[PDB]
Design a protein around this ligand. Structure first.
Ligand SMILES: [K+]
Ligand SMILES: [K+]
Ligand SMILES: [K+]
Ligand SMILES: [K+]
Lengths: 292, 292, 292, 292
């Protein structure tokens, strides 16, 4: 659903930079077995920036097909041009996906009114649940709680993936939206704290390599067993952190290859191969989490 | 050249949001008459983000046509995917443009190495001069001086539009590159200071409405007459600031419409109409500059 | 104790800028009746910066005397010179105070090792419990969790007043210290969230004017009744915020005078009298909290 | 004058942490010989924070004595309490100092109005010229250009040591004040740029060890020979940066001891000894500058 450990899955690629079906199938099975709640296909971690709209749609359909109904698929549909966002959204209108993860327009820096207008129009062109995504450090703009409250009144807008790492925002948003509105963390290092404050889950990068643990940590947190949840979080912390020792998804794709979950760690420019020291660092975090 | 006052020209649109040729023609004649050094077609102020590649190409082509050789045209060709960037550049290869303004990949946040690989690849597949564009506030990433030093070694990469507003950068970059490498300000409010420290010009938003004063100011600065350049810069300061009271190009498009330079101030979503409060602030700035 | 609503009390002054005993007595009685847990005398809010060491000591002794054992008194003992801090601490060694609130050296910006050395020496010259105080925005330096863990091993160092507003720090510090180590919020706007994450109380400014409510909010939070705690927090939020509409303690001293708790709102330079719009703002927040 | 290279001189101490006259005498003779314009006695680099008012006065007095009229002395007289500032200034009234360097109140964070009241009061109770000192990184507060414009109207306030490193400030302040108001850099790494934009000098930390190069560099800059000034600035750059590898004055005191200029590099707590890693970094910077 839109609760628990939702994975922002990587798009495994062959040596040529094209989606590798075999590796994608392995990852999906892994998530189905590990207890992951849902899969966000072609989000930032899935290299949505270097995949054209057609390739993007292909990856989503393939994932949907490989999921075979065993696990829900949420599609990344963000764009910085309102017409473009609506257009990408419409490709999935009756695809089988359960909702869309749509980011605030990046680079062009619209006003809060622009942000509002942008999401309102997208929402009016689909029946699919829309989950807002705010990540000021990559977009150059920040969706404020007041605007979220406004947008939460649109029937189709059902939640938000908050990636600021600004924990005071959980309750500022909660105070303005209904209890039905879903609050998901967008920052692994603080997801547990986010949950202890009232969040409902996390759209995770760490979950790519430690799905079992992340799912367990989230269930406990959900049941209010924060003390035992912290133990898992402590084992994972070096991963929550070192997975960004280099531009995500560079560290997570290598970790995946290393773990034997994907065939290659190939990425598309401007993402480049992990450095040697980067390898050493990630390998240690893996060791510490007990995955290696 | 790639010196002096270069206008980051707006893309005039009708009520339907489609490019308006008559207004564009008017703007071009205005710059030819005011002494503007060159025109940057379809850059950030030209709404590159909301124009599809086909519209992007048509606008650049229309501009060349309307310019009729009277003023050089530089096309915005930035993308956050290297392959997309290369393709976009190939569509302009022998169009008649003098160079390309290429922005650091936004949103995906690549490393200094990725940034290096990105631009090197683009430069390798064209013969047009490349002008790098650094604006961390909008992209989420920063092209450091040392990376600029590496890139400047590529025959094709001839300059940089620096928009951090961090003036220590002028001499940090200046010392790492060749004497003929061009440094252009990308921040109107600090452009004269930038030029006083060693820069060669400015890719201006203010030049859209104060083309003549900007051209004189830059010429005075280039000649070392900073005191007399400061006088003009003081008249223009409110505009340098107020043109950003609301998300650019919202204030400047309104200002063009107000002066009778363009028919409408219509923009594409997520850009919204100027507020009444914005109208009065920009208007007062126009009077201060002596334009209305 | 070192739990619940601890007030960073203002130092009421006559028209001449000297402590007003009558007004101080009224405030202390108010806190005793309202259920405030403890009083931090001559802290930042109490204008420790404009009071010399002798006047500082006089205010503490007077407060201690007026408290008459009905409520614990913690004394502010911070200084940016280690010898000076030790010296001020020693004046209170057998005064009757229950502990000292000592801030990280301001202005001189020592290293983490310097911070460590600084608090270790102070602690070695007293038997009084020491509560560390980290407020990077006023001091220019930041005491990191790792250093806190180091210092928490010193028997005499018993807790920390965290005023960064950085909520991820509650559990980073908790992971490194014993469960006996006290974590107090130093930021009213986020104190409840701080408590929900594991904090034990708040050294509050808001408590100066809404002591009953703050004490109640803290007890509920302590008993795990966060939902009802939020209701009180919501009523107080405009106060948590507008109390800093001007340099603290300018807004809180006026609120105090307005409420009739102190005779005058006189402050010492560089603190200046509240502005008219400042008054209007604070008066509204008071209204909203139902105090006015 | 209040032009050129002005050294923010260190306060040499023996093993016990007491002021060492012999080393001070040596430093003063060094500046007299190297061409240093003036000496700032007991400023931030001189450990004003760990010296009591009596020690502060003795050091300033010793310096005047040892200077024996061969070089002007400016005393640091800043305090975060207006009354304390006024008193400190009165102790130097007819001492022979040429002016006072007075820092914006740190820690208590006053408003622009408070800042204005503070300096006006100080200026009113002395006849010595006042040089304002803005360093937000250490004080937690910022003296804006417009407040500087107000203060500059006070006969007595003659200049500002600007240490933000924000170069747009030069002309923002320049345009608000009288032609004879002095602008001094307080940031070594950006001092030449600051001077190139209109500043008159720099109150330097690097001048402690490279007095001669700094004096020539500033004279060249004052004469408009920026190219030849840049050459020297490049040699000195590693030092401009490395002298802050560890909390100033830790690196610079070590450097003085290393050159044989001072007997010991002892500091007072919270300042701690230089680390071995620091030793090697500063040493390499000394070789680069050609001093060792
Ligand atoms: K809704
Ligand atoms: K080149
Ligand atoms: K302890
Ligand atoms: K003056």
């Amino acid at each position: 659903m839109f609760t628990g450990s939702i994975v922002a899955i990587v798009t495994p690629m062959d040596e040529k930079g094209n989606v590798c079906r075999a590796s994608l199938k392995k990852l999906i099975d892994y998530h189905v077995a590990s207890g992951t709640s849902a899969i966000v296909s072609v989000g930032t971690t899935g290299e949505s920036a270097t995949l054209n709209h057609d390739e993007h749609a292909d990856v989503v359909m393939m994932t949907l097909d490989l999921a075979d109904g065993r696990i829900p698929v949420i599609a990344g549909t963000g764009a910085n041009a309102t017409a473009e966002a609506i257009s990408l959204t419409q490709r999935f209108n009756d695809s089988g996906i359960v909702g869309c993860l749509t980011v605030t327009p990046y680079y062009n820096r619209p006003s809060q009114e622009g942000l509002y207008q942008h999401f309102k129009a997208i929402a009016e062109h689909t029946d699919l649940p829309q989950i807002l995504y705010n990540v000021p450090s990559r977009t150059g703009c920040d969706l404020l709680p007041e605007t979220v409250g406004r947008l939460a009144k649109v029937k189709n807008i059902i939640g938000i993936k908050e990636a600021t790492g600004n924990l005071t925002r959980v309750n500022q948003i909660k105070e303005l939206v209904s209890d039905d509105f879903v609050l998901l963390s967008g920052d692994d290092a603080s997801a547990l704290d986010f949950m202890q404050l009232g969040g409902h889950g996390v759209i995770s990068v760490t979950a790519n390599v430690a799905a079992r643990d992340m799912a367990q940590m989230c269930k406990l947190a959900a049941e209010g067993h924060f003390a035992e949840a912290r133990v898992i979080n402590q084992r994972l912390m070096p991963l929550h952190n070192k997975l960004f020792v280099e531009p995500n998804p560079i560290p997570v794709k290598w970790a995946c290859k290393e773990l034997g979950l994907v065939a290659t760690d190939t990425l598309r420019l401007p993402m480049t191969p992990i450095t040697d020291s980067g390898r050493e660092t990630v390998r240690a975090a893996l060791k510490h989490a007990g995955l290696l």
